[PDB]
Amino acid sequence: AKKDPNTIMSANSSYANGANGSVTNLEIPAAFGYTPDFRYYHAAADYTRRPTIAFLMELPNCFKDTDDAAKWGGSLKALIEMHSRTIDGLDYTLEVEHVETPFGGGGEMMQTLSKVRRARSVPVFTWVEKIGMPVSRFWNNYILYFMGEPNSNVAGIIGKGGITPAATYPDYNTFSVLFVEPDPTERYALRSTLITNMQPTGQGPEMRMSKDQTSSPEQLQISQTFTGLQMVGRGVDKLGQMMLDRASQTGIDLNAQPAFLSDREADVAARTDGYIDQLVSSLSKPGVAI
Amino acid sequence: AKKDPNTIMSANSSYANGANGSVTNLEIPAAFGYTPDFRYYHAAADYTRRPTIAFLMELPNCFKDTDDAAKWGGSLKALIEMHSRTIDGLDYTLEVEHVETPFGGGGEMMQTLSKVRRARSVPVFTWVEKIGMPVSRFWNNYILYFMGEPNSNVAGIIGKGGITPAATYPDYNTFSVLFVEPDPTERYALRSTLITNMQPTGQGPEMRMSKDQTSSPEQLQISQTFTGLQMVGRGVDKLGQMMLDRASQTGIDLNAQPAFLSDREADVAARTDGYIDQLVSSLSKPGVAI
Amino acid sequence: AKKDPNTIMSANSSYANGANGSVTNLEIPAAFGYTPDFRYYHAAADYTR
Amino acid sequence: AKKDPNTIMSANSSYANGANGSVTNLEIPAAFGYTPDFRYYHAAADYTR
Amino acid sequence: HVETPFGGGGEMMQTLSKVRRARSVPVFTWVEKIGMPVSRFWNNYILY
C-alpha cells in the first residue's frame, strides 16, 4: 500500500508532453541491471492494449438528397460505432532511411541520415449479418446510388433532378471517423488518429448463392475495406480526450442494473399450476401450536 | 415473449426498398459498444443461409423439331428443378477501383473514385446417375444433336430436311433459369438471379471405362457447367416473390401424411404363418370368467 | 424462347442483296451505347469463320 | 461534410470562359509546398478521363 | 466457346465455336507365369 514518490512523473513534460494519464518515470532503477530491486516493483507494471473506439465526426452530404436522411445517418452511426465486431488496418509507424559510404577499406561503413516517413492506415471493418439482412442492403445501395453503377458507371441518385454540379467532390460521398485507444479505466486517451476520405473500396459485401440440402445452414460475416487520409498529433489527442470526457461513468454499476424482466407475464399467472400455486390454493394450514 | 416495438423496421424504405419480409431495425443498440443490454437481445438473432431454388423459365426451340417435344421438355425441367443434387458458382459481388496521388512526401496519398464493376455467374449443376443411364444419355444427345458434332462440327438434327434458317441464334438451343434464396419459412425471397443463354460448356459427362474384377463397384456423378447472362435488381426480386407465392404450404403436414402402404399385401395374407395367425386360428378360445 | 420479330432482316435488300442465309438487323439497340438491354441480346451473337 | 467555400470558382471566367461545369479554383494551397494541409484536401481530387 | 463483353459492367456474352471428343490410349496388364510366355510373346512380336 506504498510506493516511492518518484514512481509517477510529477509533471508530464519533455517527451511526455500532451500525455493525458499518469506516465511512469524511466529514471527509477530497473530489473535488468546488476540485480532486481524489490523496493521499486510498483514501477514495473506493464502496458496492455485495449480495444479501439470509432467516433463518427462527419456524415456524407448525399444523405440530404434522399427521402430520409435521419435513417441513413443513424444507420451509418450505429454501424460505425456499435455494430463494429472488429477493426484492423490502422498504423502510423515511422521509418527512417540512411545513405552509406565505406569508412576505409577494412569493412566499416559510415551512415548518414536521409529521410523519415510514416505508415498508412487502411481501415477494415467486420460485421455479422442479421435477420432481414440489412447490412448488405445498406452498403450495396450506398455504393450503387451514391457511387458508380456497374452497367453505366453513373450514380443512381442522379436519376433525380437538381443534384448539384459539385457532386464529384469527395465531401458528397465520404465521411470521417476518429479512432481512440483508452486506458484500462476508460478515463484517459493513450493514442488517437483522425482518418477522413472514407468510402467503400475494393470488394463489396459477399453476395453468393448455392444449393446443398445436407449441409447445415451457415452464418454470414460482412467485411469491408475503406479509403483514408489520416492525421496524428497533439490536437488529435486533445480531441480524443474531449470525446472520452463526454462519456462519463459516474453512477453506473452493472451489478445493480435493474433486471430486464420486472415480473412474470400475465399468461403465466393464469395457469395456476406452478410451485407457488400449490401452497396458495392446495394445502390446508389450520396452523401450528404446542 | 416481449420484444421492443422498434426491433423490426415498421416499413421498408430507403435502402430496404423492395424488401419482401421483415427487416431488423439497425439503429437498435448492439452488443459491441460499452456494454450489451439484455433488453435488446431479440435484435441479435443472426441471419442464416438457406438452399437455393431453381425454376425453369424457357425451353429451347429445337425440342419442337423432335418427335416428342413433351418428353424433352419434361426431362429438362425435372433435371433442373428436382434432380439437382448441388448448385454453385452464382455470384454478383461488386468491385470498386480508385486512383492515387501522394498528399505530400510523407507517405500519405489521396484516392479518387475510378470505376465500379460486378461479378459474373458460372452455374454448375451436379447429378447422380440412375439405372439405364438417362442423365448421361440426355446430355450427350443434347450436345450431339442440338450442338456441334465432333466429326463434322454440325448439329445432328439438321439431317432432317426442312429445318428452318436462324438456327444459329441462342433461342434455338438455349434456355433460362431463375434462382431464389428464400427465408427460413420459405415464404419471402431474399436474393435472386435471372440467368439466361444457358447451355453446356466445357467438359461433358464422365465417359470412361475400365476393368478390375477385384474392386468394389462404384457410382457415377455428373458435373455440368453452363453459360449465361444474368440480371439483378428489384424487378427480379418481385418476379422471385411472385414465383414463391406459388408453392404455398397451406394445408400440408408431413407428420399427418398417410403411409405409403395401407395394409399388408395379399401374398402375405395367404401364408398363415404369422403373429396374428396364432391368435386367430391356433389358440383355443374357451373364454374367461370368474 | 422468344425474341424480337425485328431481329433478322426480312428482305435482304440494300447492302444485303444477294445474301444466302439470314442477316441481323443493325438498327436494333446494341450494347455499346448508354447501357445494354437484355431484351435484345439475341442480336449480340457473333461471327465465327 | 464541409469544404472550403473558395474551393470552386465563383464564376467561370478568365481561362475558364465557356466552361460547362464546376472548375477547381487553382488558387487553394497545393500539397507540394512546405507541407500538405489537411484543411484543403477537397481540392486535391483529380480529373479522371 | 468464344466471348465478347456485353457492356462495360463486367458481364460477357458467350457463343459456340466447336465440339471435340476425347481419345483412347488403352493399357493392358498381365501377371507373369512359369516360363516367361508373356514377355517372350510380346518381345518376339515386336522383334519379328
**CA–CA min distance A153, chain E (Å):** 8
How many CB atoms neighbour CB B284 within 10 A?
Answer: 5
Residue A271 to residue A277: CA distance in whole angstroms: 9
E contact test, residue of A144, A147, A151 with most E CBs within 10 A: A151
The DSSP call for residue B280 is I
Give the nearest partner residue to A134 out of B26, B116, B181, using CB atoms: B26
Closest CA to A60 of A85, A81, A77: A77
Is there contact between C and D if contact means ≥3 C-beta pairs under 8 Å? Answer: no
Answer yes or no: do A196 and D42 touch at CB < 8 A: no
Cα B86 from Cα A212, distance rounded (Å): 5
Contact D45 B108 (CB under 8 A): no
Cell of B231: 440480371
Please give the sequence-ordered ranges of beta strands (E in DSSP) within A45-105, or none if there are none. 53-58, 86-88, 94-102
Q: Which residue has the cell 471493418?
A: A125
Residue C35, classified by CB atoms within 10 Å of its CB into exposed (0-12), middle (13-18) or buried (19+), is middle
> Measured between CA atoms, how close is B177 to chain C, in angstroms?
12
Is the dihedral angle over the CA atoms C5, C11, C17, C21 positive or is it negative?
A: positive
CB-side exposure of B204: number of CA atoms within 13 Å?
20
Which residues of chain C are within 8 Å of residue E17 when distances are taken between CB atoms?
A: 48
| Calpha distance B19→B12 (Å, rounded) | 6
Tell which residue, A176, A236, A190, A138, has the closest CA to residue A12: A190
Asked if D22's CB is within 8 angstroms of A165's CB, the reply is yes
Cell of A156: 443512381
- For residue B54, give every residue at least 6 positions away whose Cβ sits within 8 Å of its Cβ, in sequence order, or none: A211, B80, B81, B84, B87, B177, B178, B179, B180
- Inter-chain touch D36–B108, beta carbons under 8 Å: yes
Nearest to B25, CA basis, from A201, A68, A64: A68
d(CA A219, CA A228): 29
What secondary structure does DSSP assign to C15-39, as a single string? GGTT--S--B-TTSPPSSSSS--GG
Question: Which is it for strands A109-118 and A208-211: parallel, antiparallel or unpaired?
Answer: unpaired
Report which DSSP code applies to A219: B
Q: If DSSP codes are grouped into helix, strand and coil, which group holds residue B53?
A: strand
- What are the φ and ψ backbone dihedral angles of B137, each rounded to 5 degrees? -65, -45
Contact (Cβ atoms closer than 8 angstroms) between residue A25 and residue A42: no
In chain B, DSSP assigns E strands to: 53-58, 86-91, 94-102, 109-118, 124-128, 175-182, 189-198, 200-201, 221-226, 229-231
Cell of B85: 443434387
Q: Which residue on chain C is closest to A150 by alpha carbon?
A: C35
Q: Which residues of chain C neighbour B121 with C-beta distances below 8 Å?
A: none
The identity of residue B246, as a single letter, is: R
E20 Cβ contact list (under 8 Å, min separation 6): B150
Cβ pair B32:A206 closer than 8 A = no
SS3 A93: coil
Which residues, in sequence order, are CB contacts of B121 under 8 Å at separation 6+?
Answer: B89, B90, B91, B92, B193, B195, B228, B230
Measured distance CA(C23)–CA(B191) in Å, rounded: 39
Resolution, angstroms, 1 dp: 3.0
